[PDB]
C-alpha cells in the first residue's frame, strides 16, 4: 500500500532514463518492469 500511495505517473528527449537529478527524490530502482517502465516512478 505504501509504495502505491506515493506513485508518480508521467504522460506520453530521453524519458524513462534514470537521470542524475533523480538522486534522492525518486527511487533509482523502484519502477514497473515493461509496459510503462521508467515513466511511472516512486518517491
Amino acid at each position: 500500500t505504501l509504495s502505491h500511495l506515493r506513485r508518480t505517473n508521467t504522460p506520453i528527449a530521453k524519458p524513462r532514463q534514470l537521470h542524475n537529478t533523480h538522486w534522492g527524490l525518486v527511487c533509482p530502482a523502484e519502477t514497473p518492469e515493461g509496459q510503462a517502465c521508467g515513466l511511472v516512478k516512486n518517491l
Binding site: 509504495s3 506515493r6 519502477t31
Partner: protein, 138 residues
C-alpha cells in the same frame, strides 16, 4: 535552529555534499577485507545517510549494495505481490480479494529503514531454511 535546510534539485546545482557525514570531514593501519572508498574541504551540507535515496520496496532489500541493480528493481515489483497481513482490520473490510499469510515472521536481516517502514511488525514472508543444492533435478 539553522541545523537542516530543505533543498530541491534546482537549488542542488550550486552545492557540495558529503556522504557519509564524517568520512568526509575530519583529520588525516586499515582493513583489507573492507570495501574501497574514494575520499574537497569546501562543502556546503552533508547528506543525512546515503541509504535514503531508496524508496519503500527498495529499503526492504538486505544488502542491496551487494546486489546487481536490475535485480533490486525486479524485487521491488515483487514486494508488492508478496503475501502477508496488509491490515489488521481485514476481518470487517469487504474488499474484493485479500490474502493473509497463515504465519508471518519478521525477517532476520533488517535494513535500518524497515523500522520506519513498519515491516518488523507486519511482515510478508517466512525465514525458511534454504539449501543451495543440486538434488533430484526437479
Amino acid at each position: 535552529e539553522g541545523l537542516v535546510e530543505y533543498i530541491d534539485a534546482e537549488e542542488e546545482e550550486s552545492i557540495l555534499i558529503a556522504m557519509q557525514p564524517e568520512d568526509l570531514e575530519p583529520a588525516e593501519d586499515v582493513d583489507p577485507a573492507k570495501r574501497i572508498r574514494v575520499s574537497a574541504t569546501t562543502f556546503t551540507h552533508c547528506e543525512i545517510h546515503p541509504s535514503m535515496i531508496l524508496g519503500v520496496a527498495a529499503s526492504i532489500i538486505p544488502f542491496p549494495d551487494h546486489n546487481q541493480s536490475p535485480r533490486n528493481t525486479y524485487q521491488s515489483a515483487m514486494g508488492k505481490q508478496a503475501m502477508g497481513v496488509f491490515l489488521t482490520n481485514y476481518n470487517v473490510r469487504m474488499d474484493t480479494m485479500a490474502n493473509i499469510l497463515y504465519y508471518p515472521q519478521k525477517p532476520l536481516g533488517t535494513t535500518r529503514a524497515m523500522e520506519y517502514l513498519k515491516f518488523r511488525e507486519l511482515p510478508a514472508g517466512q525465514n525458511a531454511i534454504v539449501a543451495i543444492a543440486c538434488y533430484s533435478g526437479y
